[PDB]
Design a protein around this ligand. Structure first.
Ligand SMILES: [Zn+2]
Ligand SMILES: [Zn+2]
Ligand SMILES: [Zn+2]
Lengths: 78, 70, 815, 93
């Protein structure tokens, strides 16, 4: 039963941010927000943009984005 | 009488002003979303735009475009 | 119970003889039950299976992994068994196998970490003065290993005490040997502790025991080699006693002292190097004149190291070292040994590298005419290496005289044939280049004489000489001699020996490559009909050289042959496009390209498409390759319409062949296929909507190769149109078809953008139907793993509900 | 077929190919445009496994490559591509 194709599909499910047919809107959007914040911290001119728009320092913006990564979108249901 | 409007998340929208009926009418738009920061007109049918993420684009209306639609 | 625990430790048999899954499961089980099992039974079962005489290397590696994992869990519970572990695995530190040593080192490291430093010292202490050299040797090696595992500063006090012991010169010997083994095992990572190690061992150079003095010198040499090039401030209190000792001692001890000197001198600055080299060089000449083989092997290395430092002068070397060196070191007994032979050649090449090639070559050239084959061989090796490193810019007349005389004599009198003389001849003449005009006649006379007879190995050697010398034979403004030897080569074309045939084919190819296709003495019109039946030989060397020769002819001299013969050659070469060897395959691809360019596509493609239908699978692949080669060499503008007319024929097993051909063709031409997507789209639209599954599979392969081949050239319109026809096939239950469709979609991701793919995919991620959701999440997971960061710009806007915030506000900021 | 990929973190060892499967891509089996050099993990290059073929396991005589299509799609950025036989044991086929 051990094929390459079922090994590929199982390794895809291990990559964080990947979903299946029982993924909820909450999970999908939490993934979206988390890698959005990581990408803002990676790209230097997007961070420059936000730091000019809200009149803050870049270290302060990075710290705020880090703090927002623990619970974006609020708490889950149930 | 042509108006190019930039949207925050969508690309450019094309608008015509009908003087005699006092109307602003949309006659074209784009198929991609763009976080537009700035735009410049190159000629009567061509816009250059820039994005929040670092891209430049040029968008052109096809020659068959009817400015007078509803 | 004790009788049950072995029955559970059958986990070991599971680990040794089992598949990867069983091995991993049993590894887990034993590493979670190690503490409950205990160190007694675990090792009482592992050690016999470790010292079994039928164990293999992979099972030993697996057992090493098991020992590591159980030592991690049992941390101090092994103290009452350290001695047993060490008795079993103290060998494998001196084994002949390289991996046995590595695994023994890993086991000793993990054991020294599980137990303490104190336990290891208390267990290994008594076997330090044991009167068996073997035991002391392994104890020193194991102490070096525990030092590498626990850090040197932990073992510095024990060594400081054991190297100054007053009761056992055997213990002193063992401690200094431990320092030497530490240096050898750890390398340049000893540099922060150099001063401490040298201070521990420096009192041993003046010991009253000769064995202790010798091991101290060897340890100093090991530390210097490990520290090279840094660290010389830590060797002063040895710099003085070492030079006093080389002026006082004689024998083995002198040999060790000189080895240490030789390692220390390349560490110094210019003045120190010069001074210390003068001293060591005086005693080094006295040892130049010596009987002992080990002594001479040491002395050669010391000379090589001294003469390579910056402070030592080329003039001083020329006036003091070279006369006695060449006087005592270049003889037949030096030629007879092997290790000393290899050391002497290297020392002489490196001496030349600083003194000039002229000195060395002019000193050893006249020995090229000698009655000793091995002496001639050694001289030729040395001269060839020197002229390959430095060149001939400093060689002058009366020296080229002797050089050419000698290499000619050495080539002629060679009885046993080996590539040394061949490569020396080649290097010498190619380093001369233009300057050897006045010698080419007698050179070519010698080559012809060797080629005319002599058992065909002389012939093959002469053929290789021609091969590597033809370039300078023409660039020296000379063509009649190479034309004549090409004629006599062409006469040698029916041979009993394939390796000689390959060599003469190579010589012919080298000649036709440099000589004009015009202006040539053997005519092509008579050469090629002789070449054509050789294409049937099955020796790989013959095949490759013959095909390469025919390719060179078709490339430069196509206007001398008829399209009929070119057609026959094409159809004879066709089946070699799938040969088992990479060299034959690449040679055939090149030759077919040249011939197709020579004639044209019109009538070749006729027969190719003709036999597309009447051939079976193993022969169809070569036809597909040939079609793609023709389209690459003569533009696909001439191939595609004829190939699509073949699809117009109403027959499966023909339409499939056309589709396979198109797939491999786009894959092979690459970015050239950007002008031909619109021409092919209607065929693909018909094929992607078809009842036959193989049609759709092959058409998706075509789309994939097209989209990956054109990337960054702007065919997004054509590929969007095709994506509209690829997408309806994602609801396919057949494995190979769905696998082709997914690959086409991943190629279209690269070609079109993740934005359009995400726009197609957002439809069914939250469909009510679980099947639709399955398919769409597969597609989305592909698009997400490839280009995760580009999707930040393409996600749609999702609104806040009562409880959760889903809007991204930073992107709504305006400046 | 009981064949998977290794897919462990690859290191500084370079993959080899025997003379049968010499110019192929270790991923897609193609012969067109070898582009990127193959790295394998330290466990798959050890002891008696040093220098064996990535695809089949025979004696290696050349270096293994990724083709240009796999490089473009970034298929060189997954783990070690050595083929593992799950149906047998270590010293087996
Ligand atoms: Zn590939
Ligand atoms: Zn691996
Ligand atoms: Zn292989």
């Amino acid at each position: 039963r051990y094929t390459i194709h079922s090994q590929l599909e199982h390794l895809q499910s291990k990559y964080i941010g990947t979903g299946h047919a029982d993924t909820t809107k909450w999970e999908w959007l939490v993934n979206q927000h988390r890698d959005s914040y990581c990408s803002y911290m990676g790209h230097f001119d997007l961070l420059n943009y936000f730091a000019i728009a809200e009149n803050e320092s870049k270290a302060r913006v990075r710290f705020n984005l880090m703090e927002k990564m623990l619970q974006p979108c609020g708490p889950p249901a149930d | 009488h042509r108006v190019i409007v930039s949207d925050v998340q969508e690309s450019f929208i094309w608008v015509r002003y009908k003087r005699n009926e006092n109307q602003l009418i949309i006659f074209a738009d784009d198929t991609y979303p763009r976080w537009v920061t700035t735009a410049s007109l190159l000629d009567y049918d061509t816009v250059a735009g820039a994005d929040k993420f670092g891209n430049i684009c040029v968008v052109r209306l096809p020659p068959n475009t009817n400015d007078e639609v509803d | 119970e004790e009788q049950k625990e072995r029955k559970i430790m059958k986990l070991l048999l599971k680990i040794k003889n089992g598949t990867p899954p069983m091995r991993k499961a049993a590894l887990r089980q034993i590493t979670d039950k190690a503490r409950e099992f205990g160190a007694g039974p675990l090792f009482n079962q592992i050690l016999p299976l470790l010292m079994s005489p039928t164990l293999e290397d992979q099972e030993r590696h697996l057992l090493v992994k098991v020992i590591d994992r159980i030592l991690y869990k049992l941390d101090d519970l092994v103290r009452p068994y350290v001695h047993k572990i060490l008795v079993v695995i103290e060998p494998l530190l001196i084994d002949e196998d390289y991996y046995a040593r590595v695994e023994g080192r890993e086991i000793i490291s993990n054991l020294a970490k599980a137990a303490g430093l104190a336990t290891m010292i208390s267990t290994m202490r008594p076997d330090i003065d044991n009167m068996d050299e073997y035991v002391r040797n392994t104890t020193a090696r194991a102490f070096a290993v525990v030092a590498s595992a626990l850090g040197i500063p932990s073992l510095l006090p024990f060594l400081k005490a054991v190297c100054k012991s007053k009761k056992s010169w055997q213990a002193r010997h063992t401690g200094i040997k431990i320092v030497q083994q530490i240096a050898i095992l750890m390398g340049c990572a000893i540099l922060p502790h150099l001063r401490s190690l040298v201070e521990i061992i420096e009192h041993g150079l003046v010991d009253e025991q000769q064995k202790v003095r010798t091991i101290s010198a060897l340890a100093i040499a090991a530390l210097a080699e490990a520290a090279t090039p840094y660290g010389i401030e830590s060797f002063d209190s040895v710099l003085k006693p070492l030079w006093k000792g080389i002026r006082q001692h004689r024998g083995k001890g002198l040999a060790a002292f000189l080895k240490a000197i030789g390692y220390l001198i390349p560490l110094m600055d210019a003045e120190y190097a010069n001074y210390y080299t003068r001293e060591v060089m005086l005693i080094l000449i006295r040892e130049f004149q010596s009987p002992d083989e080990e002594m001479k092997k040491i002395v050669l290395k010391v000379v090589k190291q001294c003469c390579g430092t910056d402070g030592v002068e080329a003039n001083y070397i020329k006036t003091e070292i070279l006369p006695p060196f060449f006087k005592h070191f270049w003889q037949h007994r030096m030629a007879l040994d092997r290790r000393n032979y290899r050391q002497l050649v290297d020392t002489t090449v490196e001496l030349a590298n600083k003194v000039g090639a002229a000195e060395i070559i002019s000193r050893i050239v006249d020995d090229l005419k000698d009655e000793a084959e091995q002496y001639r061989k050694m001289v030729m090796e040395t001269i060839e290496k020197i002229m390959g490193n430095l060149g001939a810019a400093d060689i002058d007349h009366k020296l080229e005289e002797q050089l050419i005389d000698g290499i000619l004599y050495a080539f002629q009198e060679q009885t046993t044939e080996d590539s040394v003389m061949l490569n020396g001849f080649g290097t010498v003449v190619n380093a001369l280049g233009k300057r050897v005009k006045p010698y080419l006649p007698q050179i070519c006379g010698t080559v012809l004489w060797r080629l005319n007879n002599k058992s065909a190995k002389v012939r093959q050697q002469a053929a290789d000489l021609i091969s590597r010398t033809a370039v300078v034979m023409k660039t020296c403004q000379e063509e009649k001699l190479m034309g004549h030897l090409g004629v006599v080569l062409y006469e040698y074309l029916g041979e009993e020996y394939p390796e000689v045939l390959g060599s003469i084919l190579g010589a012919l190819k080298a000649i036709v490559n440099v000589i004009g296709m015009h202006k040539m003495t053997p005519p092509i019109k008579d050469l090629l009909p002789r070449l054509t039946p050789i294409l049937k030989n099955r020796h790989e060397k013959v095949q490759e050289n013959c095909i390469d020769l025919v390719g060179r002819i078709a490339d430069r001299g196509a206007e001398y042959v008829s399209a009929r013969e070119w057609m026959r050659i094409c159809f004879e070469l066709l089946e070699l496009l799938k040969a088992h060897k990479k060299a034959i395959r690449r040679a055939t691809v090149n030759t077919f390209g040249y011939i197709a360019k020579a004639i044209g596509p019109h009538d070749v493609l006729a027969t190719l498409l003709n036999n597309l239908k009447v051939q079976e699978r193993q022969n169809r692949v070569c036809t597909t390759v040939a079609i793609a080669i023709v389209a690459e060499t003569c533009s696909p503008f001439t191939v595609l319409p004829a190939l699509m007319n073949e699809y117009r024929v109403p027959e499966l097993n023909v339409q499939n062949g056309v589709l396979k051909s198109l797939s491999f063709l786009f894959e092979y031409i690459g970015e050239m296929g950007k002008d031909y997507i619109y021409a092919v789209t209607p065929l693909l639209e018909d094929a992607l909507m078809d009842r036959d599954l193989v049609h759709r599979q092959t058409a998706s392969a075509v789309v994939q190769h097209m989209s990956l081949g054109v990337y960054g050239f702007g065919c997004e319109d054509s590929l969007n149109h095709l994506l509209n026809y690829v997408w309806p096939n994602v609801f396919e239950t057949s494995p190979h078809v769905i696998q082709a469709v997914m690959g086409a979609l991943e190629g279209l991701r690269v070609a079109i953008g993740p934005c359009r793919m995400l726009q197609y995919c957002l439809q069914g991620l939250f469909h009510p139907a679980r099947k639709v959701r399955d398919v769409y999440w597969k597609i989305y997971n592909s698009i997400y793993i490839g280009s995760q960061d580009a999707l930040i710009a393409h996600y749609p806007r999702i609104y806040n509900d009562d409880k959760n915030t889903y809007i991204r506000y930073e992107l709504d900021y305006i400046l | 077929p009981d064949l998977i990929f290794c897919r462990k973190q690859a290191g500084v060892a370079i993959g080899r190919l025997c003379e049968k499967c010499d110019g192929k891509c270790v991923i897609c089996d193609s012969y067109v445009r070898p582009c990127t050099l193959v790295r394998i993990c330290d466990e798959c290059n050890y002891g008696s496994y040093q220098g064996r073929c990535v695809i089949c396991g025979g004696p290696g005589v050349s270096d293994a490559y990724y083709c240009k299509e796999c490089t473009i799609q970034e298929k060189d950025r997954d783990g070690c591509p050595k083929i593992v036989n799950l149906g047998s044991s270590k010293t087996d086929l």
